[PDB]
Design a protein around this ligand. Structure first.
Ligand SMILES: CCCCCCCCCCCCCCCCCC(=O)OC[C@H](COP(=O)([O-])OCC[N+](C)(C)C)OC(=O)CCCCCCCCCCCCCCCCC
Ligand SMILES: CCCCCCCCCCCCCCCCCC(=O)OC[C@H](COP(=O)([O-])OCC[N+](C)(C)C)OC(=O)CCCCCCCCCCCCCCCCC
Ligand SMILES: CCCCCCCCCCCCCCCCCC(=O)OC[C@H](COP(=O)([O-])OCC[N+](C)(C)C)OC(=O)CCCCCCCCCCCCCCCCC
Ligand SMILES: CCCCCCCCCCCCCCCCCC(=O)OC[C@H](COP(=O)(O)OCCN)OC(=O)CCCCCCCCCCCCCCCCC
Ligand SMILES: CCCCCCCCCCCCCCCCCC(=O)OC[C@H](COP(=O)(O)OCCN)OC(=O)CCCCCCCCCCCCCCCCC
Ligand SMILES: CCCCCCCCCCCCO[C@@H]1O[C@H](CO)[C@@H](O[C@H]2O[C@H](CO)[C@@H](O)[C@H](O)[C@H]2O)[C@H](O)[C@H]1O
Ligand SMILES: CCCCCCCCCCCCO[C@@H]1O[C@H](CO)[C@@H](O[C@H]2O[C@H](CO)[C@@H](O)[C@H](O)[C@H]2O)[C@H](O)[C@H]1O
Ligand SMILES: CCCCCCCCCCCCO[C@@H]1O[C@H](CO)[C@@H](O[C@H]2O[C@H](CO)[C@@H](O)[C@H](O)[C@H]2O)[C@H](O)[C@H]1O
Ligand SMILES: CCCCCCCCCCCCO[C@@H]1O[C@H](CO)[C@@H](O[C@H]2O[C@H](CO)[C@@H](O)[C@H](O)[C@H]2O)[C@H](O)[C@H]1O
Ligand SMILES: C/C=C(/C)[C@H](O)[C@H](C)/C=C(C)/C=C/C/C(C)=C/Cc1[nH]c(OC)c(OC)c(=O)c1C
Ligand code: SF4
Lengths: 172, 72, 318, 98, 83, 69, 115, 156
């Protein structure tokens, strides 16, 4: 349980390695769901909750749409998978070797600075109001309705304008 | 002689009494509730099933079935 | 003692799921003027177990054109998420107590759409791809309104905790101050669970069987167990949210018994609905949800934002 | 925290490599631009939680808000690229050399 | 003023979803303005004590700050008990 | 007739009550005859941890009252 | 830890039923059994060819509305603020521009599927 | 022996599950398929025997050939039969399917569906009455009941 966060961030890393090799967008959309889920679990481990579930919710609807677009516009006869091509399969395997090397190396020349394998877990939560009541990330995110109302104006306008933007882009 | 199945355009005027009826039909799904009622009534009818092979469907003396050679 | 507590959740649910298949076939029967199963066991009670055993002795299919990794993953995901939706449900005390249970239900439900998508896409067949692209269309239809409806109801509740709905409904069902959202909520759950008149991903009439046309045997059994578990859960969730069962801190057995009666009754209405209506066209499902429900849901969201403000009825945070 | 940022930051680099190293589909390059948004969102979320800065937690949400718009605008353009050549291959978008 | 009634009756007959949607949208913006309870929403939220009420040093020029919480001074929630 | 649906509807009913009843009792059986303590906020979690430390058996649900001072 | 346990237990059951389904039945594989299904005749083309999406504009409008859910979900915490007037005004405007955006798309035949 | 006895009762167990869940493929050819719809109708309610029509050959156990098999349709009937997972059974229903029937001498008709697929049960009639088909369906369950796969595996 002391390696818990380290493993989640290691899984997150691979999900973006697989994503970077860019197989068929059917599988690229599968990596984003698993990285989205892994990343959701990290924000939960560090004490978040609302921020964890939102990024998971939002990326679940994004890949639903992306799936619909893949089957219509980004599909070929023989979709590529991570094992489909020997060269990509090489860099996915090799990519995992490198991290096992970079972590081991960089851990050797500093021991604490970057990667402190000797002390995984000791430094996850720094402080925490033990007798607190109002500490959920939802309260911080909810400040957009009172304190950082400017955040919401630009966010709302961004989405409002976007409807006009896409309707014109796609127009016949 | 002929009749119209789907002609009714002897247009009337939408009274406030009648408009509120159209809206309740649309918002309250009234005709869809009537259909739910018809299948509920059938739930409490006796099924038409017969207990085959212990019960048999009726047949008449003319029934054309398997062949046979008769004698005197 | 926690493992024993999983047993008394995942096993009763799975048994209750199976008999829902029997209740479905007999209620549909008598509504159609026939008897449904009644030979395999006393009144068919063994019919569910026969179908299960037969399906797991049926040869499983590995089509030559299929993408096997996702072909297998998809049914496994389907049944996992169906069982996982249950662990937060308070009845009246949940197995797993989550602060944001409602989001866990929303997020788990969405992720289960990918079992339809991946299976259909992985089958590499035209009818299974038609079924998958209806799952995409069906989700785009009901997702936006379903979340906002929950938001409206939870502004009378105060939080995303499911266990706090028990306390909100201590003196009254939320069905009364919220029957417009319950009406829209109920129709969403029929769309969420691919139930008639919204069985568009399967839709035997138009698509031979939709997304699971290439599935036979035990892998196809897992998809169904998932479909019928979700029916109970979505109606169980609707019973907690809108039809709050009686809760006395001294009689937790009362809440469960009342909770079950209303969950069974709502589950029946799914079977009642399937026997009564024709199937929607999946383009018309979008128009129903975007041109009727969504305009009403936004107005009710704005109604229920203001409503606690001008009655000084803000729910407590805890 | 130290080990997490290193892994998160390298995750962002891998997606920047993915974005900068095109293959055929334009859709695949769009998914790498979402790998980057996800890495940045998780870094910001962990930073704000670790430092207990609640007033910064609006910011990770705006990143998602302004990242969707790109995904929408990116997908809208991908429709116009497909309506012209019937695929989304980048090698087709080369008329402008002359 | 005369044609509108014809239109509204027309929409109400054939488009009640939108007529209900506009009414509820517009009724939600009026009700806070006219309700005689909208003012308490802030007050009740301000009367909920999450943080510890850190006491202040009594210099000697504090004639309207209670010494003991059961003093007859200070903010009172009687309006909330009898609300 | 229609009441022949009940034998299956009654099984399904018994099955759906075992989850709620079994969880409520298991919680009492693993928490000293009391409801499983809920901790929504950090303050409540602190109370449980303090109760666990002063119990003397490293269990938060073994309450100590005025007997103990 | 409980929430991790209960989900592995769920996964192991789904796995366990998957293994039994494949290694219990008696399997007889031949080419004509494992071909794709298409109502009794051979497929005329692979199923991986492009499949036109007639509702694509609604698909990307789902994304924009999906993120506007992410802005309304903090409301249950937001109605706990002292600045009730501000919270409410920002909420009304947000929902109103989502509605105004929806009305524009509706009137532009944006909700209609492309023929 | 004890094991040979246990194998026998395990054989009855698996048979019983296949007897009690026969899922015919939604598939009829001509007028004989009308009487197959009557067997599904309320009076006979084949559903009460555990008989459920499933559209996809992957999900179907039984193929009932209910009508004339022409040469043009012969390859397609075989293909959906091949795609049925095993175990799988064919009920040939009607004179047309049984042996050509009224069209035996036609240039365009297959003189019996059993030239194309293996047939388990033949149901005579033009058409067989819904009870006749029902008797044939219930005669297929007794055929499955006599199945002895597990016992024969033991004696191999
Ligand atoms: C529940 C099912 C588990 C028991 C059957 C496992 C099948 C199996 O792997 O047989 C051992 C395998 C044979 O697998 P198999 O191909 O014969 O599996 C088929 C199972 N039956 C026989 C019932 C049809 O033995 C080996 O040769 C490799 C080990
Ligand atoms: C999974 C749960 C398994 C429990 C059900 C298995 C028992 C099946 C037999 C049954 O229930 O009905 C009696 C059945 C009914 O007989 P039947 O199927 O021939 O009768 C059907 C026709 N009518 C309706 C006219 C009666 O008895 C049998 O013939 C099968 C007995 C096999 C028992 C299995 C072996 C023992 C297990 C080892
Ligand atoms: C839900 C789960 C239901 C299972 C209930 C237990 C019954 C298990 C019986 C085996 C399952 C049926 C498999 C089958 O029909 O193949 C028979 C096979 C076929 O026997 P065979 O070896 O003679 O067949 C050879 C292949 N042919 C005939 C084509 C030439 O027999 C078995 O080997 C089954 C062994 C049963 C032992 C139990 C564990 C098996 C795993
Ligand atoms: C004080 C302030 C008050 C504020 C609150 C005011 C609330 C007023 C009441 C509003 C109630 C809103 C409920 C939603 C109704 C609705 O949207 O239904 C209309 C919808 C559209 O159907 P349509 O074919 O388009 O006909 C109309 C033309 N537009 O048609 C449908 O919805 C049909 C959907 C049926 C699908 C089958 C579902 C099964 C129904 C039976 C289950 C019943 C439980
Ligand atoms: C596919 C596999 C199934 C996927 C399931 C997806 C749904 C899971 C959503 C994430 C669960 C969650 O939201 O975490 C809630 C909980 C945090 O608890 P909290 O809400 O703060 O309340 C009590 C705190 N005192 O969280 C916790 O208690 C700790 C974190 C638990 C995380 C659960 C992870 C599920 C297991 C995935 C295994 C990998 C699958 C391969
Ligand atoms: C997707 C793939 C995911 C796989 C990710 C890798 C999982 C394994 C985690 C490796 C990280 C380091 O994992 C483990 O960390 C501990 C402390 O945290 C290191 O350190 C441990 O041993 C050292 C001595 O060497 C002691 O100080 C002490 O017992 C402990 O700190 C271990 O030497 C290392 O084995
Ligand atoms: C032409 C294009 C632009 C037009 C559209 C934009 C118009 C501006 C609308 C957004 C208004 C934000 O309005 C601004 O809100 C913030 C907080 O929210 C207030 O700022 C306040 O912040 C916090 C509140 O807790 C206090 O600590 C601070 O001292 C105080 O100034 C400003 O006094 C107000 O001006
Ligand atoms: C070194 C281990 C660390 C991990 C390494 C992987 C990091 C992520 C890199 C993602 C980019 C992959 O980089 C890749 O470059 C190759 C050339 O080499 C290009 O790819 C192009 O040429 C190659 C070589 O014939 C073809 O196989 C490929 O189909 C074609 O698109 C693309 O531009 C990009 O897909
Ligand atoms: C471009 C999109 C625009 C469309 C949307 C427009 C929405 C406009 C909404 C205006 C409604 C604001 O309504 C306003 O509510 C606030 C607080 O809620 C009330 O304010 C009252 O209550 C608050 C606390 O609740 C007290 O602290 C305050 O002293 C008192 O005046 C106002 O009396 C009322 O006028
Ligand atoms: C949905 C599930 C069920 C259990 C239903 O109750 C019934 C039992 C299935 C039906 C209706 C059809 C079963 C097989 C089939 C494909 C028949 C061919 C057919 N079908 C016709 O119409 C439907 C005809 O119409 C004139 C025909 O001529 C012919 C030849
Ligand atoms: S046997 Fe007679 S009833 Fe049956 S399909 Fe042939 S002609 Fe029609």
């Amino acid at each position: 349980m002391n390696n818990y966060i380290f493993v989640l961030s290691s899984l997150f890393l691979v999900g973006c390695l697989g994503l970077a090799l860019k197989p068929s967008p059917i599988y690229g959309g599968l990596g984003l769901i698993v990285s989205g889920f892994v990343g959701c679990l990290m924000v939960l481990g560090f004490g978040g909750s609302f921020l964890g579930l939102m990024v998971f919710l939002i990326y679940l609807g994004g890949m639903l749409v992306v799936f619909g677009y893949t089957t219509a516009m980004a599909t070929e006869e023989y979709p590529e998978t991570w094992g489909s091509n020997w060269l990509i399969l090489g860099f996915l395997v090799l990519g995992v070797i490198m991290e096992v090397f970079l972590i081991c190396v960089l851990n050797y020349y500093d021991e604490v600075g970057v990667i402190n394998l000797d002390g995984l877990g000791d430094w996850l939560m720094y402080e925490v109001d033990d007798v607190g009541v109002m500490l959920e990330g939802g309260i911080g995110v909810a400040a957009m309705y009172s304190c950082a109302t400017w955040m919401m104006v630009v966010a709302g306008w961004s989405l409002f304008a976007g409807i006009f933007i896409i309707i014109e882009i796609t127009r016949d | 002689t002929y009749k119209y199945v789907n002609k009714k355009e002897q247009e009337s005027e939408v009274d406030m009494k009648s408009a509120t009826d159209n809206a309740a039909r649309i918002l309250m799904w009234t005709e869809l509730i009537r259909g739910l009622g018809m299948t509920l009534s059938y739930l409490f009818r006796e099924p038409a099933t017969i207990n085959y092979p212990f019960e048999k469907g009726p047949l008449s003396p003319r029934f054309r079935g398997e062949h046979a050679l008769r004698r005197y | 003692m926690f493992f024993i507590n999983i047993l008394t959740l995942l096993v009763p649910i799975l048994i209750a799921m199976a008999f829902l298949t029997l209740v479905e076939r007999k209620i549909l029967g008598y509504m159609q003027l026939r008897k449904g199963p009644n030979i395999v066991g006393p009144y068919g009670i063994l019919q569910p177990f026969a179908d299960a055993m037969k399906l797991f002795m049926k040869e499983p299919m590995r089509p030559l054109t299929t993408s096997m990794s996702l072909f297998i993953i998809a049914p496994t995901l389907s049944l996992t998420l169906a069982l996982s939706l249950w662990v937060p449900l308070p009845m009246p005390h949940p197995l797993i107590n989550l602060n944001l249970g409602i989001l866990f239900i929303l997020a788990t439900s969405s992720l289960s759409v990918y079992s339809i998508l991946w299976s259909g896409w992985a089958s590499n067949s035209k009818y299974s791809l038609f079924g998958a692209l209806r799952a995409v269309a069906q989700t785009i239809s009901y997702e936006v309104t379903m979340a906002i409806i929950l938001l409206s109801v939870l502004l009378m509740n105060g939080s995303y905790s499911l266990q706090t709905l028990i306390t909100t409904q201590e003196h009254m069902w939320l069905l009364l101050p919220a029957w417009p959202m319950a009406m829209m909520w109920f129709i969403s759950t029929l769309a969420e669970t691919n139930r008639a008149p919204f069985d568009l991903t399967e839709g035997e009439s138009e698509l031979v069987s939709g997304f699971n046309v290439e599935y036979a045997a035990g892998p196809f059994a897992l998809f169904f167990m998932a479909e019928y578990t979700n029916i109970i859960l979505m109606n169980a969730l609707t019973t907690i949210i809108f039809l709050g069962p009686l809760y006395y801190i001294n009689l937790p057995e009362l809440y469960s018994t009342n909770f079950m009666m209303e969950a069974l009754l709502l589950s029946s209405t799914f079977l009642w609905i399937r026997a009564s209506y024709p199937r929607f066209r999946y383009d018309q499902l979008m128009h129903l949800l975007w041109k009727n429900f969504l305009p009403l849901t936004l107005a009710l969201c704005m109604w229920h934002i203001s409503l606690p403000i001008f009655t000084a009825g803000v729910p407590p945070y805890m | 925290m130290p080990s997490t940022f290193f892994n998160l930051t390298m995750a962002f680099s891998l997606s920047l490599l993915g974005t900068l190293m095109f293959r055929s589909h334009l859709m695949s390059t769009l998914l790498c631009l979402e790998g980057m948004v996800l890495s940045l969102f998780i870094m910001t979320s962990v930073t704000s939680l670790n430092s207990n800065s609640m007033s910064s937690m609006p910011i990770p949400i705006t990143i998602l808000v302004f990242a969707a718009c790109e995904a929408a605008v990116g997908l809208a353009l991908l429709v116009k690229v497909s309506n012209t050549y019937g695929t989304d291959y980048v090698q087709n978008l080369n008329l402008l050399q002359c | 003023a005369g044609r509108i009634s014809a239109f509204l009756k027309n929409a109400w007959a054939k488009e009640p979803v939108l007529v209900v949607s506009f009414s509820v949208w517009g009724l939600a913006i009026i009700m806070p303005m006219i309700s005689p309870y909208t003012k308490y929403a802030s007050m009740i939220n301000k009367a909920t004590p999450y943080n510890y009420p850190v006491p202040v040093r009594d210099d000697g020029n504090m004639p309207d700050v209670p010494s003991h919480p059961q003093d007859p001074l200070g903010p009172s929630l009687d309006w909330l008990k009898n609300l | 007739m229609w009441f022949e649906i009940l034998p299956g509807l009654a099984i399904m009913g018994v099955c759906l009550v075992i989850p709620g009843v079994s969880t409520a009792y298991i919680h009492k059986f693993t928490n000293g005859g009391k409801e499983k303590r809920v901790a929504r906020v950090q303050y409540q979690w602190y109370l449980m941890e303090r109760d666990r430390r002063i119990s003397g058996v490293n269990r938060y649900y073994v309450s100590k009252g005025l007997e103990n001072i | 830890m409980n929430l991790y346990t209960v989900i592995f237990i769920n996964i192991l059951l789904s796995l366990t039923l998957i293994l039994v389904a494949f290694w219990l039945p008696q399997m007889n594989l031949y080419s004509e059994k494992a071909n794709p299904y298409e109502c009794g005749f051979d497929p005329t083309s692979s199923a991986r060819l492009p499949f036109s999406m007639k509702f694509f504009l609604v698909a990307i409008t789902f994304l924009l509305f999906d993120l506007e859910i992410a802005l309304l979900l903090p409301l249950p915490w937001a109605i706990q603020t002292i600045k009730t007037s501000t919270m409410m005004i920002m909420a009304f405007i947000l929902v109103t521009i989502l509605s105004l955006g929806l009305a524009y798309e509706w009137t532009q035949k944006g909700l209609e599927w492309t023929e | 022996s004890r094991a040979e006895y246990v194998v026998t009762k395990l054989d009855d167990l698996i048979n019983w599950a296949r007897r009690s869940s026969l899922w015919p493929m939604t598939f009829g050819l001509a007028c004989c398929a009308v009487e197959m719809m009557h067997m599904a109708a309320p009076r006979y309610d084949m559903d009460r025997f555990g008989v459920v029509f499933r559209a996809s050959p992957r999900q179907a156990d039984v193929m009932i050939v209910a009508g004339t098999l022409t040469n043009k349709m012969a390859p397609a009937l075989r293909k959906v039969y091949d795609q049925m997972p095993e175990p799988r059974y064919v009920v040939s229903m009607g004179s047309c399917a049984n042996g050509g029937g009224y069209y035996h001498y036609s240039y365009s008709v297959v003189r019996g569906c059993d030239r194309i697929v293996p047939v388990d049960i033949y149901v005579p009639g033009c058409p067989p009455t819904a009870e006749a088909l029902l008797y044939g369906i219930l005669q297929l369950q007794r055929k499955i009941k006599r199945e002895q796969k597990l016992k024969i595996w033991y004696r191999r």
